[PDB]
Structures are given as structure tokens and as C-alpha cells.
Ligand binder design. Structure first.
Ligand SMILES: [Zn+2]
Ligand SMILES: [Zn+2]
Ligand SMILES: [Zn+2]
Ligand SMILES: [Zn+2]
Lengths: 364, 364
């Protein structure tokens, strides 16, 4: 069967929770074909302290010794520039993640984004320390006057001026618009990068999830298992995301936003938790998309080369040098991912067939 | 005001199901402030025979002797013009409801709205007998990859040409665009009624629900209790819907589309049943909107006059002459509506407070 050497794969947007959920999902990073994971910090309470983020990573490394973990802080008024310099000097974080208040799980108390001024001391310190600023780029919803109303469909577009102003005010800060979902955002990222030759000049990039390469509004209208933030939008948005994924441009790379929830948190009649679980088959999901687009030769850049370059992942921090190999053996997504105890998760595209599987190969 | 005499109130879009659900629901039409109800036919199996529609009405009258019941057929493969004539002269039906196949609850036996042609004989017989053609005006979803995508957000607008074509081909047939949700549909209805100024001139009307005058997409995205068909759309759409409701225009009147589902059919991780249950407080929901718009003076037309006129309801058909009196005692909506056995419903805006109650006064 056909095979594709993908090398050291990167998922630069991972949720792994705590407790028994973390013990279930953290080994699945490797199982899904991912060597390097960027760990998001929206725990309860958020990660805003150095000892917390040190312990968390060590807990993850214990659960999965072959996986390379890049950590983050949650953007909070609790952060100080001193805490940034210290954490960055100790290699305890690689970036800081911004959640606008109220917009997704564990996002209030995050921040309001027609502002960001109050966090300029933090960004300054991050810029100095070469830390990445990650953005859940959605403006909070507003329906009354005066302005044009903000809702789950235009909230990403409405965020794009904040993105531009941040890039303007901090031209040397690395910034990521996480999990892009709209055509408008894709074009904004390309227009920000119009003068870029060679990958190493990219200062603003965007990540793309597996599930937004498949879903539109119709897939989650009536199916909480497909409901996430930002919400999957219109077919034209989906087309633009897939084109960007297969484009070979260095400012689009893979981040799953795999966000696990126990099934009973998805089958609520009110307050469904947002989040789609894709960790267990992360790279096969993507392979499905690159195959259907006749773009397999661009797979390696999207799930490996470009994320490593943007984050400057050194071989010396890599926990395992095994390479992820895709091999074209068909498989069936299970109905549930379970720990055999109190946790069942519905995986993305549960029940469906995937053309590809992943295995691991020693280097040299 | 305090106390408004709404007369013989009209809800021209009602679902009461069968069995224990029906026993719980059909008394609440009255309790909700409604005198005249138009009963939709999407039972299992669909209501498509004379004996069934007669026995159904008989069951409903026993459960609520003072409610006026206007009945309907389900637009079916099995219907014939002979049955339309026979059921019309026996006054067993007042209209026929069209469901497009698969767009909503119990629509799997519905039609293909791209080709209505095989139902033109049914529509010619309805036109003779002065029966009403109700339309759930949405096209089924088409993702396709060639012709225009149809999805839950443009599926109503995509249906508008079909509506104009049926109006053109049957100019004397009373037709209703049920539960309008978009500004485009408001404009097409206002359009078709360019040169009608009161009231009996109207041939093509549209009903507006309680929930669509409150809801936007933000309210049902993570809340299945607010999920219904057609889906609630953008703030710009709800603004057109609300302005159309308090408009005093005779081509807009109240139809609740109260659609009860047991709470287990809403707390699903997939296949959430579509439907908002608003029967228990229908008139007070509407009152709140007209109050906030400073337009109580048009409440009587929206909730009584225009529906009685368009359906040509006669005093001789009315099961009780009691008048719906709207009085301003605050009430708090329950968290649950229950029969005390197996059935529980989450009502619309559960836990919220309404400014108005409604009671029944006789005519003397
Ligand atoms: Zn996010
Ligand atoms: Zn995330
Ligand atoms: Zn309907
Ligand atoms: Zn209905």
C-alpha cells in the first residue's frame, strides 16, 4: 500500500483537559499521528501561574513520553510582564492565548477585544521574549444599537480589525489567528502576508482545524456533536478554508482544536458545550481532504513544515524523533472513544470510513 | 393599557400530536389565550384520509370543548382531487399543508418543491373549494458541488420563487407562507401585496411565530430547546419580522408553530428534534413584543382580526364565544411542563417572567 513520510507532525491547537479526561486523550495525540502538540490553557481555573504550567506539562509528559509539548498561558489581567519574562526564560511557555469573554468554553473571564490596550505590557514582554500571541478571533456578540450587530456568523469577520491593529502596534510579535472559519479571515491573512518571501518572514499566521475542512452550518444545525467555536459557516467559507489548507503557503498550518467533552455534555437541551473531538484520527482526517483535492504533495508542509518553522521547534527539544508515516489502509471511525470507566467521547465523523492510517517509524 | 379585549384570538399554526402528548397539549391552547387553532397534520402516519381527520378533530374537541378547531390534510402522494372535494363539502378540512421532504419533523413523506407539477390537480381542486394551501417554505438542502448550495440559512429564500410560481398559476387560491424567518420573505410578501389595501383582497399571507420575534441564530446555536425550522436567522431578519408583526398590515398574522417534543428528544448529541413549544403562553409572548414596540393598539389585528378575516371564520363555526382578555399580572414561565407521567416539555423562554396573563370572559 502507498505510504507518505510526514516526518515530525504538528498539531498547534490541542485541548487535553485535566483529570481522567486528560489521561484518556493525551495518549491519543501520538495515536492520531501527531508528534508535537501546542497545549491550550483554558482549564478551570485557567493557567496564569508558572507552577501550574510547569506541573501541567510534566503531567502530560508522564501520560505520553514520546510527545513534544509546547505550553501557553491564558491571557489574564493576572499576568504581569515580569511573569512573562520569567516563564519565557525558563522555557515554561511558548505563547499566550487570548479568549474574548463569553465566546467559547472557559472564556469568561477572558478579555474584551475592542480594547487589548490593557494588555500591551504583556505583549511587549512577549515580543521581547519571542513568544507567540494566539487569538480566538471572535468579537463578543452584541445585538442592540448602535453599531452593526455581532452574531456567531460574523463575529470572526468583526474581529479582523483588532487583528490588524495588533499587527500594526507590534510588528515583530508572532501572532496566530486560531482556527479560521471564514473566507474574509483567509483573505486578511493572505493580505497581511503579501510581501513575504520565504517562510521565516511570516509574523502573522492562521491555523485550520480538521473539522472546518468538512462542516458547514447544515452539519451542526440539529447536531450538537458538530457544534464548535467558531461555528462552521457557509459552503463558500468551507471552500476558501480547504483552498488555503492545500495552498502550500507558509502562513496556514494545521491546528485541530480538538476539544473533548464527555457525551453527556453534548446531549443537553440547553448550554451544549462547544467543541469537536478529532485527536484520535487527526492526520487521517486531513489526509482525506488533501487526497480529495489532489494535493497530497502539500500535506507535509501543512501538518509539519510550516508549524515547526513558525514556532521554531528545535530538534533538541523534540521528545521523540520517530516519524509519522501515512499508509493507505482503510479504517472505520469508532462510535465512541471511551476509557472504560466514566468517560465516553463521540469522535468526529463517528462511523465513517477513512482511506488512510498512521504508524510510526524510527529515523536515520 | 391594563386589560385588553383581544376578542376571538387566532393561532393559525398549531401542533398537538397524539396520545398522552395530545392530552397534555390541546387544553393549553385555551390556557394560552387562543380561541381558534389551525391544527397541522404531520402525525405518524400523516393525516391524509377523511376518517382520520374526522376522528382526530373528535378527539381534540373532547379534550377542549370550547376551542375552535380548523383541520388540514398533509400534502401527500396518496391524496386525490376527489378526496379534496369530498372532504371540503363535509367541512372536514380548511386547508392542506405542504412539507418539503426531510426539512422538518415528520416530513419524510413530503414533496419535492422543485417539481410541484404532480400536485397541480390537487391545487386546482383546493382552489374550487376555497381551501387554504399552507407551505413550510424551505427547499431541501443541496450541497452539490455544481449548482447553488442550499442550507438552513438560505433555504427559505431559495423557496421564494416556488411561492411566486404557485401564486401565478393559481391566482384565486389562498396561500400561506408559514412561519416566515427572513427579511427576503417579508419583502416578497409585501411585494405580492403591493396593491391590496384591506383585507379581503389578500390571497397570499404569511404567519409569524412567537419565537421568531425573539430568537436569532445566537439563541439556538448551543441551545437545542431553541432549535426549530425554519431556523432563526440574523438580527437583520428578526428586525424585519418584528416590524412586520406590529405593522397593522393584513397579510401578517399570528401562527405560533408551537411544536411539542419530550425533553429527551431535545437532549440528543445528534438528531435534535426541531420545534419550540409556545402554546402554554402564546398570547402573553406576543403581548411582550407589542408592548416593547409601543404598539399594543395593533395586537388585536395581529392576533385576531387578520387571521379570522383571511380564513373567513364565521360566528357559526366558533365553539365558544368567550373573549380573550389580556390582563397585566406578572407570571413566571415554568422550567418544565409535565403531565406527571412520562412527558415533560421545556417551554419557550422557560424561567423568564412575562408581564401579562390572559383570562376568558363571556359574551353577554
Ligand atoms: Zn478557540
Ligand atoms: Zn481551542
Ligand atoms: Zn413548518
Ligand atoms: Zn409547524
Amino acid at each position: 500500500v502507498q505510504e507518505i513520510d510526514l516526518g515530525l507532525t504538528c498539531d498547534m491547537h490541542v485541548h487535553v483537559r485535566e483529570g481522567a479526561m486528560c489521561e484518556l486523550v493525551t495518549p491519543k495525540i501520538r495515536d492520531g499521528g501527531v508528534s508535537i502538540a501546542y497545549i491550550m490553557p483554558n482549564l478551570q481555573p485557567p493557567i496564569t501561574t508558572l507552577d501550574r504550567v510547569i506541573e501541567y506539562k510534566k503531567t502530560l509528559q508522564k501520560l505520553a513520553p514520546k510527545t513534544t509539548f509546547l505550553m501557553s498561558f491564558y491571557l489574564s489581567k493576572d499576568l504581569t510582564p515580569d511573569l512573562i519574562h520569567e516563564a519565557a526564560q525558563q522555557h515554561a511557555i511558548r505563547g499566550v492565548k487570548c479568549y474574548p469573554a463569553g465566546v467559547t468554553t472557559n472564556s469568561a473571564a477572558g478579555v474584551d477585544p475592542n480594547d487589548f490596550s490593557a494588555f500591551y505590557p504583556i505583549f511587549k514582554a512577549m515580543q521581547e521574549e519571542n513568544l507567540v500571541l494566539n487569538l480566538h478571533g471572535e468579537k463578543p456578540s452584541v445585538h442592540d444599537g448602535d453599531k452593526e450587530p455581532i452574531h456567531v456568523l460574523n463575529a470572526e469577520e468583526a474581529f479582523l480589525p483588532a487583528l490588524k491593529k495588533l499587527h500594526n502596534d507590534f510588528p515583530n510579535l508572532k501572532i496566530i489567528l486560531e482556527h479560521c472559519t471564514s473566507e474574509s479571515a483567509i483573505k486578511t491573512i493572505e493580505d497581511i502576508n503579501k510581501n513575504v518571501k520565504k517562510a521565516t518572514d511570516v509574523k502573522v499566521a492562521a491555523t485550520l482545524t480538521a473539522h472546518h475542512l468538512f462542516l458547514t452550518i447544515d452539519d451542526w444545525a440539529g447536531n450538537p456533536v458538530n457544534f464548535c467555536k467558531p461555528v462552521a459557516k457557509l459552503p463558500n467559507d468551507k471552500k476558501a478554508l480547504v483552498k488555503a489548507a492545500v495552498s502550500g503557503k507558509p502562513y496556514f498550518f494545521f491546528g485541530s482544536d480538538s476539544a473533548p467533552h464527555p457525551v453527556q455534555n453534548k446531549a443537553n437541551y440547553e448550554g451544549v458545550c462547544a467543541g469537536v473531538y478529532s485527536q484520535s484520527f487527526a492526520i487521517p482526517y486531513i489526509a482525506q481532504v488533501f487526497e480529495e483535492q489532489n494535493a497530497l504533495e502539500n500535506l507535509k508542509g501543512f501538518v509539519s513544515d510550516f508549524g515547526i518553522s513558525f514556532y521554531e521547534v528545535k530538534d533538541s527539544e523534540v521528545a521523540s524523533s520517530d516519524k509519522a508515516i501515512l499508509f493507505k489502509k482503510e479504517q472505520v471511525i469508532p462510535q465512541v472513544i471511551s476509557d472504560g470507566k466514566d468517560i465516553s467521547i463521540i469522535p468526529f465523523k463517528a462511523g465513517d470510513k477513512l482511506s488512510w492510517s498512521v504508524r510510526w517509524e524510527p529515523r536515520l
